[PDB]
RNA sequence: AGGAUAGUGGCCUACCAUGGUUUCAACGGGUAACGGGGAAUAAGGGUUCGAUUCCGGAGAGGGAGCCUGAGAAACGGCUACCACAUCCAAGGAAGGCAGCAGGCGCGCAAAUUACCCAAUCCCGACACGGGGAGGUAGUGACAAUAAAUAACGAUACAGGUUGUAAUUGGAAUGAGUACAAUGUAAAUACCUUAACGAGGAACAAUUGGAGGGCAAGUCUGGUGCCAGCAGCCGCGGUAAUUCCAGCUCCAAAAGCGUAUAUUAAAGUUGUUGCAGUUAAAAAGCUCGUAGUUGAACCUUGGGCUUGGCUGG
């Protein structure tokens, strides 16, 4: 009989194992866990700002070879350091140590994309200043 | 929460005065007075939004402040006062009475009466019994208390208010087979004869009520007001429309006729 | 790894400025200019058909 | 504070970004009614699909249904109103197989085409944009217009208009005046 | 260039001592009417005061040639000054626009005066005392 | 039984019994929890959200206690303590923006210290006063609606009676500006409308892409496992369809992309509707309480009369 009770009173017993088995549903489990409130570097929020501490350059996974050009981060809010990727040829020169940088995921939510390793974040701004308008020189970096 | 409320949001007032969303914020509260809040049709509304004598809130208020509006032989001057089921609105004025009677849509009409008929009223006896020094009393649907009443007079009769005395011309009892309109729910409105009462002690009465169209609906009998001491003889003029419900396809239907 | 060559491709393309060229039309007219190129005046290859077909 | 205002998206999307089937029949149907991009064309299909929506709820119903009968004929007189639906097809099954087509028949727009009163489909939004055409004696400047049945005959140059007996326009005054 | 007047949903209203009507403007080759000339052609056409005459509430409608608005006419002019709002006497100049300090002022010196109990000139004979 | 209360009541007191809730989940804990009307998405069933235009509740920095009053345990009332914090002549005194506007801070994250009681309504001894309640304007690409950025001829050619590709014309119009009138409490704006207002009509449409998924290049130059791209698969080591650019083209367009959450896709939470020999998964095996589920059987057939609605 498929193995779930089918009678017409068993509400309570259908009711109380399908709460037992959406534990096994890690997006279920995630989100009453609350995981990234207490675990996630930017407690939830899509974006999150911070410092740059230092640039460094991160060499890809095989079968890539490159240098990724990404920087290290503490975030304002939490005081998490993070390691984001500053995307765009050349980018790099327009980030500076104790810059203001707006960062944002890569889009697999919490995963590292491609073949950077350990980095889970990006930067979308630097000093107020959109990276992309800075990159097509519609804008420059005020300092 | 510390005390009584003083104000009516718009989409909060009752929805047979058939007010607009977008007019404003609020809503006029009905006075404490003869009718409730959500059974009643103050004179602000009647005055601007149904007659549309007056063209704003100030405006009304200038009408009354003469003397113009009498509500059951009385002059008014409270724009938000209660008017409800079966009051008499004079305007001498224009020369006009008007009785608050409900149409068959649920909502007050328009409903001009005679200088004659504007004389009286009636009201739905709600108790009666004894007041101070053993004196009998009968209230009415409209807070009236009349002392020394007929001894035959009992809960659910209706009872004709000379209206200028305060008395008690004569009255009807409540049994079966007397003309009916229904005061409340969803088929507030409608005219019939009580074909059978029902009782349940304890809980809600209800009545069957026969239409002239040989419809039956049933009511709770807080709900029932006899207006007529048989079918086809009311004791008051009824709203156009003699509260018959149509479908809305033969609402349709007639519209059609009407318009071509 | 060393952060020294930021920049190296970008830095070293040769610019080329853009050819100056009529403005194309817009809302509607394109619609227009885009409905006629691929259904009035059809430049298939006897059943090959491409839009940005290269010099060959 | 004040009651809430409704509003409502008069459009949808498809659920397939890129169809070479779908792309090709959209462009096609914009060049022949001269519309000015997709969404005009969302739009109709939005507001029919729900047109659909609302016959195959009744059709469902029982026949002699009283909600049937009621809504069902209400939105049959509708379409028939508008002549998108023919005055021989009044049975709630030609509703559903109505097409997008039927109803850019009756923009203002495409009349204004069909009645010679422009040379071609955008000439005639061009006129109905810049206040020459009028329904009745009503200037109409929307070229998504949808033209009743009893508007048909009465679609014709704005009275004031230069093409309809007025003055002559801003460019001809400047050039004959000089 | 023959401007034509219709009035529609007229109701008659003895209780504000006026008849009160919709108006609608017929002003082909004409952007649209005065309020002070409909004034004057709506007095003409019933035979009433000027000055008894009110108009507001005008609106052209799309493609232009046509008005709507609303109107009012008085049994007389000492009616129309009893009944009309502030406002609109001013518009047609049988009033004066009263002359007050701005809203921040008047609340301003309303609660300046609120530190005061009794007259004004006791408090400043009190002040100037204390000060000598 | 009393006391207290506006009044019922362990609400409190005295005396007396030993009761009351719980695997049908009590009690405790968590909630990035005010509840509901509702919102998003949705074939159906569902999943997620609801601080927030309405209704109910609670609070006015945190507690507690009260006065007045019909009504408050009120905070634009008082009293005290705690925490903040203002003036001081150092003796003292005065505080409470989770009202409107505004400032600091916090942050990914949110507008004017504007005008008015004209409307909606409320309050008062009141036709008259007051109302940052409310309305009006400012900022406002939160979302939503409609909807410009061109149209039509002639030549010249190509072309199969007419669709274009170019260089040649005369028309049309609102974006904008403005007399004015309207609008309004007064304005602004809209709507109307004199005069002005379009050839590169420079009055110049953008945002993303062009290996596949996925629509649109095997074009040209640059670099050479570097720089970089790439949601995923992958591209780049000297003819790179993928990087940086030019050209061309594609998609949506006054909008388009990115991040995060959520819904569909997901019959990958399965009641409808999953899977368990070997892909993850039948307890080592029996007993067993709650739970769930439990064979068949008791007025059937027949006859007569009649009302209505479907087809004719």
New interface residues.
Partial sequence: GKGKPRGLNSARKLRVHRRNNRWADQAYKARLLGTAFKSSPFGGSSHAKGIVLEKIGIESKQPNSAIRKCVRVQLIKNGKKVTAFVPNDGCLNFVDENDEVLLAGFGRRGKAKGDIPGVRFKVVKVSGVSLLALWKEKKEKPR | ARGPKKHLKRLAAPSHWMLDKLSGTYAPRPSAGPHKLRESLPLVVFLRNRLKYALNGREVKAIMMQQHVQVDGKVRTDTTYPAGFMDVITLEATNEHFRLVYDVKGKFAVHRISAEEAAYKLGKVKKVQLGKKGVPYVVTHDGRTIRYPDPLIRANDTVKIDLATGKIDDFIKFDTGRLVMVTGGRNLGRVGVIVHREKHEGGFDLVHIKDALENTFVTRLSNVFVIGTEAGKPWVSLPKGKGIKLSISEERDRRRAQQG | ???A???????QTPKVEKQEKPKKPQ???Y??L???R??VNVTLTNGKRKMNPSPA | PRAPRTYSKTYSVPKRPYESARLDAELKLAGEYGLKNKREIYRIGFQLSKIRRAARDLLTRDEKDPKRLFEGNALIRRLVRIGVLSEDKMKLDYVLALKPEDFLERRLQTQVFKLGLARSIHHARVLITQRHIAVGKQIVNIPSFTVRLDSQKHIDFAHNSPYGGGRAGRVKRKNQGK | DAVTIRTRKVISNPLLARRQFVIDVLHPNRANVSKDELREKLAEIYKAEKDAVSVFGFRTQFGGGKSTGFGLIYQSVADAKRFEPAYRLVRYGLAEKVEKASRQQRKQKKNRDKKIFGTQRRAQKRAARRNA
């Fill in positions: 790894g060393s952060l060559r930021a920049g190296k491709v970008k830095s809302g509607r007219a619609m227009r885009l409905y006629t691929r259904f």
